[PDB]
Amino acid sequence: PLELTQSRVQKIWVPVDHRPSLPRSCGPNSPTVIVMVGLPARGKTYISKKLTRYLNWIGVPTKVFNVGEYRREAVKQYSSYNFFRPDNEEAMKVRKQCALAALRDVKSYLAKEGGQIAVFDATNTTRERRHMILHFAKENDFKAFFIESVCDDPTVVASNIMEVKISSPDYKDCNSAEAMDDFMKRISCYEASYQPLDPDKCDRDLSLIKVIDVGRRFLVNRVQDHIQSRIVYYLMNIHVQPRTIYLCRHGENEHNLQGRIGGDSGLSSRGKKFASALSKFVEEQNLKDLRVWTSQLKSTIQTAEALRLPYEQWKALNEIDAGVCEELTYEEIRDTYPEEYALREQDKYYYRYPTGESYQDLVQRLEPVIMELERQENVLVICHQAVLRCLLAYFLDKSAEEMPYLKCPLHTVLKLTPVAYGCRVESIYLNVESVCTHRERS
Amino acid sequence: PLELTQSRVQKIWVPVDHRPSLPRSCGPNSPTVIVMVGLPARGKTYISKKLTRYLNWIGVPTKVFNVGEYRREAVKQYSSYNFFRPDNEEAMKVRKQCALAALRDVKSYLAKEGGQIAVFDATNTTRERRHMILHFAKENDFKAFFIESVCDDPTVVASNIMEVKISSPDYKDCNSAEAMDDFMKRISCYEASYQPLDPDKCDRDLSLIKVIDVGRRFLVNRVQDHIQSRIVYYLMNIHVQPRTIYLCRHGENEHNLQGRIGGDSGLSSRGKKFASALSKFVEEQNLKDLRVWTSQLKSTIQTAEALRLPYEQWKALNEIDAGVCEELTYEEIRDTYPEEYALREQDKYYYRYPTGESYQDLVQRLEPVIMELERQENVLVICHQAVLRCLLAYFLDKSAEEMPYLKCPLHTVLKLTPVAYGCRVESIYLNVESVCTHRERS
Numbered sequence: 001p002l003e004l005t006q007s008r009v010q011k012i013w014v015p016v017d018h019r020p021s022l023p024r025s026c027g028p029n030s031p032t033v034i035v036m037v038g039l040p041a042r043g044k045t046y047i048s049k050k051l052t053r054y055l056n057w058i059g060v061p062t063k064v065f066n067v068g069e070y071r072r073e074a075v076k077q078y079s080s081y082n083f084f085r086p087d088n089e090e091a092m093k094v095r096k097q098c099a100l101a102a103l104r105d106v107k108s109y110l111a112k113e114g115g116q117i118a119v120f121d122a123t124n125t126t127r128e129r130r131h132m133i134l135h136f137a138k139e140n141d142f143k144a145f146f147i148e149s150v151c152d153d154p155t156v157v158a159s160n161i162m163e164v165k166i167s168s169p170d171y172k173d174c175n176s177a178e179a180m181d182d183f184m185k186r187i188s189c190y191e192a193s194y195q196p197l198d199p200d201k202c203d204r205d206l207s208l209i210k211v212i213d214v215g216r217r218f219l220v221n222r223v224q225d226h227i228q229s230r231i232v233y234y235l236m237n238i239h240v241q242p243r244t245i246y247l248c249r250h251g252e253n254e255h256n257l258q259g260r261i262g263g264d265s266g267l268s269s270r271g272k273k274f275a276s277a278l279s280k281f282v283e284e285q286n287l288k289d290l291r292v293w294t295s296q297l298k299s300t301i302q303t304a305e306a307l308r309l310p311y312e313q314w315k316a317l318n319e320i321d322a323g324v325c326e327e328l329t330y331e332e333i334r335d336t337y338p339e340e341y342a343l344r345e346q347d348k349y350y351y352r353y354p355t356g357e358s359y360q361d362l363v364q365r366l367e368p369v370i371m372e373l374e375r376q377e378n379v380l381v382i383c384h385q386a387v388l389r390c391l392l393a394y395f396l397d398k399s400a401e402e403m404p405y406l407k408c409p410l411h412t413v414l415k416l417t418p419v420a421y422g423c424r425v426e427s428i429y430l431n432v433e434s435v436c437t438h439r440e441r442s
Numbered sequence: 443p444l445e446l447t448q449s450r451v452q453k454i455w456v457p458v459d460h461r462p463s464l465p466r467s468c469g470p471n472s473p474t475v476i477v478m479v480g481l482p483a484r485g486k487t488y489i490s491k492k493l494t495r496y497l498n499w500i501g502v503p504t505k506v507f508n509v510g511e512y513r514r515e516a517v518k519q520y521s522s523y524n525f526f527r528p529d530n531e532e533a534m535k536v537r538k539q540c541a542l543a544a545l546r547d548v549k550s551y552l553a554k555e556g557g558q559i560a561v562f563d564a565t566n567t568t569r570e571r572r573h574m575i576l577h578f579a580k581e582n583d584f585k586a587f588f589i590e591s592v593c594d595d596p597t598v599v600a601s602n603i604m605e606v607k608i609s610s611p612d613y614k615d616c617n618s619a620e621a622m623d624d625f626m627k628r629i630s631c632y633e634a635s636y637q638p639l640d641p642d643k644c645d646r647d648l649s650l651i652k653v654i655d656v657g658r659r660f661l662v663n664r665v666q667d668h669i670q671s672r673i674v675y676y677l678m679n680i681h682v683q684p685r686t687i688y689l690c691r692h693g694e695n696e697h698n699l700q701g702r703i704g705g706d707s708g709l710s711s712r713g714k715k716f717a718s719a720l721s722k723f724v725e726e727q728n729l730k731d732l733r734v735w736t737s738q739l740k741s742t743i744q745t746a747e748a749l750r751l752p753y754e755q756w757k758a759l760n761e762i763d764a765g766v767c768e769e770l771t772y773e774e775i776r777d778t779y780p781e782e783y784a785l786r787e788q789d790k791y792y793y794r795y796p797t798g799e800s801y802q803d804l805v806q807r808l809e810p811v812i813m814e815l816e817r818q819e820n821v822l823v824i825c826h827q828a829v830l831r832c833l834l835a836y837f838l839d840k841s842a843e844e845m846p847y848l849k850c851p852l853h854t855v856l857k858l859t860p861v862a863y864g865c866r867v868e869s870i871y872l873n874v875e876s877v878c879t880h881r882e883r884s
């Protein structure tokens with residue numbers, strides 16, 4: 001009794017499955033519909049996209065269903081705010097059809113495509129629309145969680161229109177002034193029928209978060225589960241303040257020169273040159289304040305030492321653990337462990353080294369790093385190749401499949417600037433030679 | 443340049459400190475005063491104690507300053523609610539003196555004792571008292587974070603009085619009915635001057651959390667930093683619903699028989715007998731629903747397999763990593779690594795195994811396990827000796843120094859029942875022999 005086998009890729013102990021003559025599969029917890037609530041230019045799409053990026057990265061399949069994109073597909077060219085008028089009988093029918101078509105795709109995503117979270121990105125400003133979404137959720141056995149963004153600051157509204165609305169495909173033939181004016185009129189079309197969430201009386205039984213004044217204040221009502229609690233925590237940690245994230249690896253180490261993986265080797269002569277070059281680079285950036293984070297491995301600490309700035313060591317930033325393959329070259333891995341080598345090449349994200357880690361394990365370890373990176377402003381993270389690929393996949397919205405192959409060369413700073421609905425990435429090579437540790441797929 | 447040395451105990455790379463002829467120390471971020479707000483029997487002491495237990499366990503030095511305890515010290519015997527009357531000039535002076543004496547001890551704790559968080563556990567129901575606490579915080583460069591508990595449910599109030607108030611040292615000479623009646627009158631003394639937190643107008647600039655109806659709803663205003671954000675997340679995950687936490691180790695394994703540490707060995711014949719005994723025990727508990735958690739190591743999975751219940755594997759529950767000492771006996775550790783053996787014996791909590799972990803690393807890894815244990819109801823955790831000691835230290839409020847020496851024998855279930863201001867612990871030995879893996883300090 002109690003016979004188990006270790007799965008070759010992930011190294012998970014599973015019951016020995018001696019399937020009977022006729023093997024039967026029991027093909028395939030409740031999915032969630034996240035309902036965005038609020039007037040236009042309230043950062044609903046910003047929240048939708050960012051939350052989806054985070055949820056997918058942590059391993060929760062998430063997709064955004066933006067009703068405006070269904071509208072741009074149904075209606076060829078956008079002319080003006082007149083399309084959004086409450087007295088526009090025809091466009092009101094079209095807009096309802098678009099919302100229903102998005103919900104149809106929500107049902108298909110959650111019940112038939114293995115999706116766990118569907119973010120329904122629309123105004124959903126009326127109780128009637130929200131009652132209809134709730135009916136849709138109850139009949140399909142989906143959970144409903146509401147995220148309302150409330151902001152009456154005209155500076156914030158104008159900034160949102162200028163940053164991401166005027167550049168919308170709707171305003172292609174318009175200049176900045178025309179687009180801004182049309183969008184203000186477009187917002188006014190929604191103001192009369194807007195019924196904010198009322199957790200006090202009407203929406204008392206709804207699971208919701210009210211994000212007030214760009215995350216200055218929050219009203220949290222009836223958090224049912226783990227995922228809603230995580231979302232709430234995330235929303236409370238993110239901000240829209242201007243800042244820069246610099247990501248780089250430690251300067252070239254002795255193991256890099258020998259083509260050895262893992263270990264805790266020190267900087268090579270070139271690595272020490274990069275460390276000095278990094279200090280000059282950091283100085284030239286002229287940042288008011290800068291937080292410096294390293295791993296607990298020698299090579300990242302030695303690199304930070306050259307900066308003459310306070311730094312914090314995170315064990316979570318330590319390179320992927322190669323288990324039995326630690327301190328070995330890739331040639332020695334292929335010759336001593338050929339089965340292990342081939343398994344990794346075939347499934348680089350999920351593959352776990354014996355007594356070691358997978359890129360999947362890295363994500364779990366790096367979750368607190370990401371949450372702290374969100375809270376902070378100017379940060380420099382001095383880490384390792386696999387750790388850097390994971391962090392970069394989060395910021396650049398790269399899939400689990402792409403993640404183990406992202407290019408993160410030595411002696412190169414990745415400058416991340418948050419703009420619109422993501423990150424602008426600039427690469428800065430600090431003109432110090434090193435070996436190449438990048439290996440493409442086969 | 444960039445010369446580092448690895449600290450012998452914690453294995454941290456530090457700059458080689460060639461102190462000059464006259465070595466100088468720069469002896470020794472801003473501390474926080476957590477201000478409890480609310481009427482009596484609102485669970486302020488419950489929140490204070492639980493939050494302090496969690497903060498200390500994660501490594502943030504925290505202490506509770508309960509004004510009522512300063513009062514019990516200043517005033518010999520408690521007679522009645524008449525002491526709390528607003529017209530009681532003398533007792534009002536005494537109560538103010540007690541609050542000021544507690545604040546004096548708050549200043550000494552945060553500025554002179556290396557404390558990071560002081561939980562000021564009092565009613566602090568008036569704006570005047572809170573303005574005075576804010577003045578105290580501003581003048582001492584301490585941050586202020588308010589936690590208000592609002593509940594007008596008479597069932598909840600009566601339950602709190604029955605569970606922990608009637609048993610208070612104040613009601614020693616009273617019977618349950620007298621104590622309940624006196625306490626209701628005592629609450630009424632505070633109702634007239636009670637000014638709840640107003641984040642809308644008056645308390646707009648204050649950093650606060652309003653816990654409404656025993657955590658059903660929350661009002662969160664101006665979360666300034668990491669620690670406040672963590673507190674908010676914690677408060678949103680905990681609950682007062684009745685439940686049981688069962689903690690045990692995997693059944694005896696092959697490494698246990700050989701006296702070997704770490705590894706991924708399978709259950710011995712006795713271990714398999716425990717697994718069957720555990721199933722019978724679980725069945726006899728007759729729990730409506732039960733979540734079963736294991737590590738990713740074979741021995742805990744084989745134990746769970748015997749239960750015929752769904753289970754979830756957590757990599758965070760994997761035994762402490764012994765690095766280079768993995769799969770070795772303690773005798774082989776003492777003979778091959780005598781310096782390492784002695785270092786661990788001297789500092790068992792902070793000691794890190796080479797390329798391995800410390801009990802301190804375990805706490806960081808187990809933080810998400812604790813947060814999920816808080817969210818859940820009936821849970822059975824099948825884990826390992828060091829992991830179990832860490833979890834138990836959290837539930838039993840044991841220090842970092844005590845933690846590596848907590849007794850967690852094999853084939854023994856630790857039944858945890860949340861009651862009053864902590865956990866009731868029952869031990870259930872399942873009558874299956876095993877080796878002893880406990881080692882006392884030297």
Ligand SMILES: O=c1[nH]cnc2c1c(-c1ccc(Br)cc1)cn2-c1ccccc1
Nearest residue numbers: 041042043046151160163211214215235
């Ligand atoms: O509350 C808003 N109102 C208007 N605009 C907004 C927001 C937020 C926002 C909302 C909640 C949280 Br938690 C964090 C950010 C982001 N944005 C935004 C910023 C830049 C570009 C595009 C949109």
Ligand SMILES: O=c1[nH]cnc2c1c(-c1ccc(Br)cc1)cn2-c1ccccc1
Nearest residue numbers: 483484485488593602605653656657677
């Ligand atoms: O809000 C309350 N009002 C009255 N009593 C209460 C509470 C809470 C409480 C409050 C906030 C959160 Br988040 C979790 C629990 C706990 N207690 C309590 C329960 C058992 C014994 C002693 C006290």
Ligand SMILES: O=P(O)(O)OC[C@H]1O[C@](O)(CO)[C@@H](O)[C@@H]1O
Nearest residue numbers: 261262319322384385386437439
């Ligand atoms: O996933 P890959 O391509 O092996 O990259 C991660 C490896 O690269 C290194 O950073 C050095 O090449 C090793 O420390 C680590 O094992």
Ligand SMILES: O=P(O)(O)OC[C@H]1O[C@](O)(CO)[C@@H](O)[C@@H]1O
Nearest residue numbers: 703704761764826827828879881
């Ligand atoms: O901290 P201690 O007393 O060495 O206990 C933890 C050790 O005990 C074991 O659980 C077995 O005795 C090992 O797996 C682990 O290294």
